[PDB]
């Protein structure tokens, strides 16, 4: 009882079903739940319903490559506890939620390459954090990534992000990934790389990125690596220049200079709202921090706000603690300070 | 010969789980004392336990990371000994968890960041810690404590923001630094930050100088004129415009060396101030704009 | 003036420049404007600026395949009057605007395959409607298409839409496309195909991988004699997952329209709503009529909804028999209502 | 032998550019007359110009599509001739453009749509035309005029007791491409073409809706939950819905076929629930007594 145009082998132990190029519109219903291998490549499946892989507790390999799957229902893989590998490459997935990958206790290979995944839910890999050995998210639309989840994947040895829009890689990641051998960050939006355990075998590819070539990449330039056609995008002096062709001396950082100060003096005698401005400039762009007269750094909390520009806004002043509100512009090449004295 | 004497002994620590705990132990004698760390009588032997010896050979530092509670919560002792002596000191390790962290426990508001300094120049690593009471700040370079006890050395710690200021940088200063906040409540480590030392690049430093100052222009009532202001120097000045006290070119990215101001509908005479800024000086120049009948 | 790892031969007249797999981040500046062929495949170009191909009036082949191009500036291909072929396949384009394809007067090959094109601006092909012989929009996110523009492309011979979300194809199209030899409509959301000049120097029309609704509206197609291209039905339930050419003609059934919710013959004489919902296979179309004229909805004084609801300000003397007509491929249904 | 005589001669048309213009010309004689179309003296010869002869051979129709102005704006003549005669009649074609289209010019509000009918059954193709004054409506099957002048044939055109085309007792010959034509004193406009298909007769029995399992009377305690089953049958199969007197309880999205089980919750008052079965052959009802007994 095999569905039309499909090739099914029901000889124990490996019950295999193959449906390549059979023009499927849906996942074949009433498929034998004792299936071990399932391959549905090169069809035209639009969506994956929960009913599709309901009771397949014997399934270990699932391949859904090259379809038009644009939607995967919640808990669609909830009962695939024996599943080792999952292939959803070359489809139309737009996101990866936790309720979709629930119950994949034995998942060791996860391939989601060549999709349009815009966002991966934080801790959507919870079902297989300790087991996963291979994760592919290449050729998607990821600008961000739940690195905190990645940092827990101990048995991970190959992580590929060949073509996305990832802006930055978290620094604390990759510290416990001792089995990691391949990390691909080619073709993203990486301006810089953190001084992590990049150096070690290990293959870390980071070509095709809009690298900002200042001091923040000096540590990497000092390494002894083969030219993987890495190229700088900024600053203008080094635009279109090959990374490893540039001498270490030309990776320059510029100290912070506070251009727009409060002017060194301010005064409000009552509860009326006050506001201070602080804007720094340098390479890389300095980070502005404010301090209270008590020497306490002020953050994004109640009654006090800080913006990307650097402006400090305080709504209800006590005035019981009047002193010098200092502005600190931290930078890789130095610090700048512009104090203001209020009462 | 001379029996061992302790120059620095570890104290009772109270760190958080997943964090760090370092025990410093130094001694002196003739011959040189060797320092061994013990937990519950036996010599420490664990993957998360590393012993880092000082460059002087004056002692070592027991580093525990990451802190696991309560497998590490015990009594550790330092045993210094030579050919003519054997002394010891013991201390208590307390390891809390995030559930048990009291309000007032040290918290790193701002940790040290990546910094690159040229040789023979000054580098500064920032650290801002909060807590009740006010925690004192110490520093650790490559798992070893930074000696800032000497208030008159290249390496100092600023009183009050206890940042670490490294003067006359040398290649030995290149390493991994981490900030430590400790009060009566406990001890919290900040994230590590790398300091890199590159060779000295002799560049000339000259304060901002107006190569082409603003000219005085006369104009018909409303009224439009372009004023050119050019400044030079190393480093290159950021040029802006003001009308007396308040800035006239707000929210713009300050151009480098040249700023041309455009005026429109000039219906009253005024003086416009051009300002050039660098880390080496701030110069000004005013242009008199008049409205003649 | 040739960039590293690039092969550029500047021997007049045919200036060729090839920069394949050289890790480019931008389109190389200072390219000789008398260049005839320019190929920049397999790099990492993020965006196309208008300055990139400013005055290249000698360019005839431009290849930008396999990059991460997500944005094409307005008038980026202006002054490319000599351009015959354009390759932008395997990129991140999200739309095709008119200001992007401006000035491609001689364009005969346009390949935009494997992108994320969500919408093609109507008449964005105006610069080259009469010249185009090849148009590829395969593997994108198109649910709609400027068919009115496509219908004017006379010299077009190959139109490929291999993998999109196209819901419906216009009926009047393809009547003037006499040189058309290949049309690919595989893997879309097509429920049906119109009885156009599909049947016919040869012609290959592929329409597999669609959620076909197998009723009378495809009967004309089933009667044809074509090879099995693995076409499959999705609806109705009786014919779900069944191969198209395997189903006998008699099983393609349409059900006549039945008006379920009439008004009941049922006001304020000062302000306007009437209900009409039919049901059948395919889903009936509701039309309203005036007592002596044909009522038009979606207008100034009269509005009609997809449900069939007639909705602004009633006239003090335009009362008569307002009849509701439910049109369908298998028949018509009529439920008149008389209001005052 | 007998020289040709005209049975129908074409008239002056005024269509829009890109549209259609058809000229009907028929004649009779012994032997049958052959009809040739001429433009400015010469026999018509163009890609957009097609001559379609009637199946009887009584004449032909000159079809021009799409209309291009003013390349086509001329005088066309019909010349019927045999061995024993040769006669002619001529008419003028005017082709406007959208710029010159007057208010009152025929406009197709709704054209004919795709239709599929079984053999020996009745098929109807709709057409709604507007204009000032009211345009007359004619029909064209496969480029030839449909003769509905005879009000007493299987093929009729409704006007009294919407000039739709009603085709009774369908036969295979009725299968073809139909198009509606609106003509007044102002001009002539064609509607979009629509195909009519004739499939074989599926002998099915016609039975009005009948309740196989009508709703039973159920008693329940205050709040309160009960399921009521209503089953109807027939060909075609009835649409079963639920009502509470006047208002509908079933949505037309979920509306079932042949079987509808109504679910009640929080029943706090006694009521009567009406079950309705609907088909194109009838509408039947049935009430179920729901009471709230302790
Ligand atoms: C504090 O909160 C404000 C928002 O209330 C943050 O401001 C935004 O920050 C991002 C980048 O960090 C900018 O792209 C947005 O434009 C900002 N929006 C607004 C309304 O300000 C700010 O980043 C936070 N700053 C800190 C130090 O936490
Ligand atoms: C702009 O600045 C100039 C001087 O820098 C002003 O001109 C002088 O004004 C004082 C009194 O205000 C006089 O004593 C001087 O004789 C003036 N010197 C010259 C050269 O004019 C001028 O008034 C200022 N203009 C404005 C609008 O503030
Ligand atoms: C005029 O026509 C459009 C359809 O062409 C109506 O738009 C529909 O509105 C309903 C809900 O109100 C939606 O369910 C449909 O999806 C819409 N149609 C389409 C194609 O998207 C529109 O409402 C009509 N105007 C008025 C006033 O009724
Ligand atoms: C799943 O598997 C077992 C046997 O394979 C069966 O007893 C069980 O009913 C199935 N679960 C469901 C919900 O049908
Ligand atoms: C000032 O500079 C702008 C630059 O666009 C120019 O348009 C304008 O004509 C100039 N005005 C005068 C008075 O020079
Ligand atoms: C009524 O139908 C619903 C359908 O699931 C069911 O849950 C419920 O138990 C039924 N109640 C009775 C009294 O049969
Ligand atoms: C329901 O119908 C019966 C008549 O058959 C009527 O006597 C009764 O009053 C009705 N019940 C309700 C609640 O209307």
Residue numbers in the entry:
A (entry chain B): 33 to 232, 244 to 386
B (entry chain A): 28 to 187, 196 to 328
C (entry chain D): 33 to 232, 243 to 308, 311 to 316, 318 to 356, 358 to 386
D (entry chain C): 28 to 188, 196 to 328
The authors write:
Type-IIa receptor protein tyrosine phosphatases (RPTPs) and neurexins are the two major presynaptic organizers. In mammals, the type-IIa RPTPs have three members, PTPδ, PTPσ, and LAR. These members possess a large extracellular domain (ECD) consisting of three immunoglobulin-like (Ig) domains and four to eight fibronectin type-III (Fn) domains, followed by a single transmembrane helix and a cytoplasmic domain harboring two protein tyrosine phosphatase (PTP) domains: the first PTP domain is active, while the second domain is inactive. SALM family proteins have five isoforms (SALM1–SALM5). Their ECDs share the same domain organization consisting of a leucine-rich repeat (LRR) domain, an Ig domain and an Fn domain with 35% amino-acid sequence identity. We determined the crystal structures of apo-SALM5 (LRR–Ig), and PTPδ (Ig1–Ig3)–SALM2 (LRR–Ig) and PTPδ (Ig1–Fn1)–SALM5 (LRR–Ig) complexes at 3.08, 3.16, and 4.18 Å resolutions, respectively.
In both the PTPδ–SALM2 and PTPδ–SALM5 crystals, there are two complexes in the asymmetric unit. The binding modes of the PTPδ and SALM ECDs are quite similar between the PTPδ–SALM2 and PTPδ–SALM5 complexes: the Ig2 and Ig3 domains of PTPδ sandwiches the Ig domain of SALM2 or SALM5. The Ig2 domain of PTPδ also interacts with the LRR domain of SALM2 or SALM5. Although Pro362 of SALM5 is replaced by Ala375 in SALM2, a similar hydrogen bond is formed between the main chains of PTPδ Val143 and SALM2 Ala375 in the PTPδ–SALM2 complex. No electron density of the meA9 insert (188ESIGGTPIR196) in PTPδ Ig2 was observed in either the PTPδ–SALM2 or PTPδ–SALM5 complex, suggesting that meA is completely disordered and not involved in the binding of PTPδ to SALM2 or SALM5. The LRR domains of SALM2 and SALM5 in the asymmetric units of the crystals are aligned in an antiparallel fashion with their long sides facing each other. We therefore tested the possibility of homodimer formation of SALM2 and SALM5 LRR–Ig molecules in solution by size-exclusion chromatography coupled with multi-angle laser light scattering (SEC-MALS). The theoretical molar masses of the monomeric SALM2 and SALM5 LRR–Ig-His6 molecules are 40.2 and 41.2 kDa, whereas the molar masses of the SALM2 and SALM5 LRR–Ig-His6 molecules determined by SEC-MALS are 77.0 and 77.1 kDa, respectively, indicating that both SALM2 and SALM5 form homodimers in solution. However, we found no marked structural difference in either the PTPδ-binding or dimerization interface between the presynapse-inducing SALM5 and the non-presynapse-inducing SALM2. On the other hand, the positions of the bound PTPδ and SALM Ig relative to the SALM LRR dimers slightly differ between the PTPδ–SALM2 and PTPδ–SALM5 complexes, as shown in the superposition of these two complexes.
